[PDB]
Design a protein around this nucleic acid. Structure first.
Ligand SMILES: [Zn+2]
Lengths: 60, 78, 154, 112, 128, 99
RNA sequence: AUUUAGUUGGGCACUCUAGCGAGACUGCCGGUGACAAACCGGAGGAAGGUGGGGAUGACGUCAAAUCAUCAUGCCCCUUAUGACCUGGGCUACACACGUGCUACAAUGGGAAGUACAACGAGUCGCUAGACCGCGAGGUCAUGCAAAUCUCUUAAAGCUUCUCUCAGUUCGGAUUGCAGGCUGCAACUCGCCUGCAUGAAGCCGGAAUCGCUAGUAAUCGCGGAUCAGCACGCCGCGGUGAA
């Protein structure tokens, strides 16, 4: 059903309290970093690929 | 908690004032889940939708405070 | 623990009477990272003690202590795999440990609505051999040598 | 019997004892005493016959009685006899917000 | 003129001690040493450097401080004293070391770790 | 005087060499330059549960850092002004000419 | 030197910021040891013997988990199991269990004065200041895209006074009434405030869990998702034992 849903958000919402966040490449509804617009796992992986400027692993 | 006046949706007000002249038609179907009760409603008969069926209920005097949704409970326990 | 014994973290002396024992007792009243309160009840109890029968907050303290610190202890050991409890030659330090432990704990149940009257009365009664802590040490010594017969050649 | 409706104790502190009566919380006593101009006095109350009348007068300006319950009773009565889900669950105890009742009986009935 | 300094650090608190000839005294942030300090009679703690060298007076102390709790920074002035007395005579440092109170206590709060409620606390855990 | 420049990047080598370049372009023409002032280096933090369906134990946390520099100059002649206007490289670190 | 003040003059000493360096390697001393490896103690030193902590998870076991992040063989639906909208669910309650928070008070309850951190967030957002209402808040206005301005003087702490051992001035679940905020809209199904009422509950069986140090115990701060809603989770710091 993910296609109808993904098509839903690209429109202007019916009311202001309806515009939520959802990953771009994948489509997770939950837990999307609204600084990057990635889901939880997609950012996890793409960090490995050296394609997000910034992010590394944090040891301290 | 709405000290800028109460609220009832317009597609019910116009449909409840339209009887103020003559007698009232026994039926006012609605959604019946966002409207408090105003003094202009006493004596009517509004059916109340519970997501499944509309529930016909009249209007008394003290039954004027709360919202419309407190008469068709969507629980059905027993 | 398993390899070998380990160090023991000695304390500093007190800023009034300069006693390692005094600090070692202040520590055994503190509850939940809150110290100053313990020092306050210690000092107030000490003054109360010195008030009636003024000799010293220290000397009568050591009197009550030597009234308490035991000399034996039942040490449950299954050399014969059974419920053998063998009287043990208690060490020096653990003696003081148990002294303070019995004193504070069993004094906590004395029952003065007042904050520190409980302690002061307890050690003052112990120095004169009246009170269950004295009875506690005597009970330990009466259960020791109550079975030293079959539990000594070990 | 004793001094205001009923239910006043002896040999207590004043402001605390004035809360005892049904309907008087803590702010009520302090404001009442303010309108007389008094204090603790002291831990065994030793009021004067005039101060007693003063407080008996200033209290009779409050809806709080041995009768406040009648108003609450009739209010929940008007509730339970019109609709009323609130009144219906008030035949079985649920609040102004609900709390997903699968422990919310341990304060109302002792369910176990 | 003549002035003597020395720093001290404990539990991520730091004090900037200043020493000068006086009567034996310390003004913590333009305040008497018994103001910044609470009830605390951990003042023998603070004079403890003196109880071994320049026994036990008498210089004065200007002192700034910031960070940590009271006990932390209180212990953290103890070491500016050591370093200052060290500035006077490098003939004292042996008797300081033997009595210690010269190296910086590196104990501090622990880096926690994800999955545990605290730095080491493990949640209660049903057996079966 | 009336000019300064901030720096915000990740690897310190590029920041430091940009610093050296701008100090050349400043103290070359005129003088009264300020050194590469360090700065608090803001840091971020995140926490990703390192699984895909369950096991909220296995966390995997990442981070971000932003080193900074800062350099002001006094008496900027028309020469070094226009040299600043033309200097653009490197292109890994973002600078910003500011009064 | 002067002002309310490090502010403003004056300075970069210190503190701090942060790059490059330096530094711990059984390096020297004694001893034990087949002279080896290693081990016990010592000096010096900030740290001595993997200084403390983290990241880092070998071959494989468990047909463990996941077609519901994504992908995919095969099987299947196809005027319907595909699709649009309103209303309700996922919040249902005779009951059994796991995890947590507040408690059963005198190291306490209340009232009044009094100081000290650290990590981070900020443009349609953090609100300065002042005014109003006891409160949740409102009004006008002020800086801040940053070591400047704000969240934000941290709370336990320290000093006095009152309360006297009681279901108590402890406990504040529950409930009546009147309000506040966001929200097109808070009955179902938000958070918070004031008043009023004031439940069980005075340290918990058999059994069973965690923990070797700045730990356990205890007290606050911040932010992730996010109009709004945290006793959860992710970090920080204060006090400080056996
Ligand atoms: Zn994604």
């Amino acid at each position: 059903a993910k296609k109808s849903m993904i098509a839903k958000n690209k429109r202007p919402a019916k009311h202001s309290t309806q515009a939520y966040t959802r990953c771009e490449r994948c489509g997770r509804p939950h837990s999307v970093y609204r600084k990057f617009h990635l889901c939880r796992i997609c950012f996890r992986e793409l960090a490995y690929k050296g394609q997000i400027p910034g992010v590394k692993k944090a040891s301290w | 908690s709405l000290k800028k006046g109460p609220f009832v949706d317009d597609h019910l007000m116009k449909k409840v004032e339209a009887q103020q002249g003559a007698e009232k038609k026994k039926v006012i179907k609605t959604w019946s889940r966002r409207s408090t009760i105003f003094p202009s409603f006493v004596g009517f008969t509004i059916a109340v939708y519970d997501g499944r069926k509309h529930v016909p209920v009249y209007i008394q005097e003290d039954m004027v405070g709360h919202k419309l949704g407190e008469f068709a409970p969507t629980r059905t326990y027993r | 623990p398993r390899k070998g014994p380990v160090a023991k973290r000695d304390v500093l002396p007190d800023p009034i009477y300069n006693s390692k024992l005094v600090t070692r007792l202040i520590n055994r009243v503190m509850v939940d990272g809150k110290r100053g309160i313990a020092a306050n009840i210690i000092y107030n109890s000490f003054d109360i003690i010195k008030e009636s029968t003024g000799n010293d907050p220290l000397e009568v303290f050591e009197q009550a202590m030597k009234n308490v610190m035991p000399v034996l202890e039942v040490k449950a050991r299954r050399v014969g795999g059974s419920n053998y409890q063998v009287p043990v030659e208690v060490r020096p330090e653990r003696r003081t440990t148990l002294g303070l432990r019995w004193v504070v704990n069993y004094a906590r149940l004395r029952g003065e609505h007042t904050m520190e009257e409980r302690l002061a009365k307890e050690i003052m009664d112990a120095a004169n051999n009246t009170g269950a802590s004295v009875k506690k040490r005597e009970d330990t010594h009466k259960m020791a040598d109550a079975n030293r017969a079959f539990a000594h050649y070990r | 019997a004793r001094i205001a409706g009923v239910d006043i104790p002896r040999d207590k502190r004043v402001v605390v004892s004035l809360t005892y009566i049904y309907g008087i919380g803590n702010t009520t006593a302090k404001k009442v005493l303010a309108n007389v101009g008094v204090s603790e006095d002291v831990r065994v109350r030793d009021l004067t016959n005039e101060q007693t009348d003063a407080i008996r007068a200033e209290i009779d300006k409050l809806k709080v009685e041995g009768d406040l319950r009648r108003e609450v009773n009739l209010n929940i009565k008007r509730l339970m006899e019109i609709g009323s889900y609130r009144g219906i669950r008030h035949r079985r105890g649920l609040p102004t917000r609900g709390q997903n009742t699968k422990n919310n009986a341990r304060t109302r009935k002792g369910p176990t | 003129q003549v002035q003597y300094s020395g720093t001290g650090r404990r539990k991520n608190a730091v004090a900037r001690v200043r020493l000068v000839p006086g009567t034996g005294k310390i003004t913590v942030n333009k305040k008497d040493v018994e103001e910044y300090i609470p009830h605390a009679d951990l003042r023998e703690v603070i004079n403890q450097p003196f109880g071994v060298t320049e026994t036990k007076g008498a210089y004065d102390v200007i002192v700034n401080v910031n960070g940590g709790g009271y006990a932390g920074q209180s212990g953290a002035i103890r070491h500016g004293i050591a370093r200052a007395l060290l500035q006077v005579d490098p003939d004292f440092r042996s008797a300081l070391k033997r009595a210690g109170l010269l190296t910086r206590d590196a104990r501090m709060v622990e880096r926690k770790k994800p999955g545990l409620k605290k730095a080491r606390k493990a949640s209660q855990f049903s057996k079966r | 005087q009336k000019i300064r420049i901030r720096l915000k990047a990740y690897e310190h080598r590029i920041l430091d060499q940009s610093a050296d370049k701008i100090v050349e372009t400043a103290k070359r023409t005129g003088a009264d330059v300020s050194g590469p002032i360090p700065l608090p280096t803001e840091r971020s933090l995140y926490t990703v549960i390192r699984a895909t369906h369950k096991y909220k134990d296995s966390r995997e946390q990442f981070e971000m850092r932003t080193h900074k520099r800062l350099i002001d100059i006094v008496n900027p002649t028309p020469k070094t002004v226009d040299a600043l206007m033309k200097l653009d490289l490197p292109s890994g670190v973002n600078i910003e000419i500011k009064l």
